[PDB]
Symmetry: C2
Subunit: 83 residues, 2 copies
């Protein structure tokens, strides 16, 4: 895998998981400590819960998987801002 130049629409910033997170639902992102995540906006605010972000793993993004199928929510305090 390479490094794609363009970033997802609405890209805000990059986070790295500091702790594993196991998805409990289909709309959640599964993480491993070390994963880089590209944070993007919620596409519906009524699904937005305090303490949660919406993202797409950098890995998925670089392999050009479709964004609607790969993005998911995760707890902000399992990560820290990077880059």
């Amino acid at each position: 895998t390479t490094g794609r130049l363009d970033l997802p629409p609405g890209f805000m910033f990059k986070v790295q998981a500091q702790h594993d997170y196991t998805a409990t639902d289909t709309d959640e992102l599964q993480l491993k400590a070390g994963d880089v995540v590209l944070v993007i906006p919620f596409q519906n605010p009524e699904e937005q819960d305090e303490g949660w972000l919406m993202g797409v793993k950098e890995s998925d993004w670089n392999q050009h998987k479709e964004l609607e199928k790969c993005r998911g929510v995760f707890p902000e305090n399992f990560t820290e801002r990077v880059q």
Copy 2:
């Protein structure tokens, strides 16, 4: 199952899970939305991570399971204080 009167040593307060949490490690507590948790102190502070609590599910406690084997850490913002 009944309602035991005594509370675990160091008991601080009671929380209820607002979202499921799947343990990713043996020292973490597995929760379901609705579970009541009895919050207790960390027995070693070098294992204490910001944003995390130590607890024992009320269910386990009421069935007199051993405390050292049933307690675990969980993310504070998956819960809210009750009672």
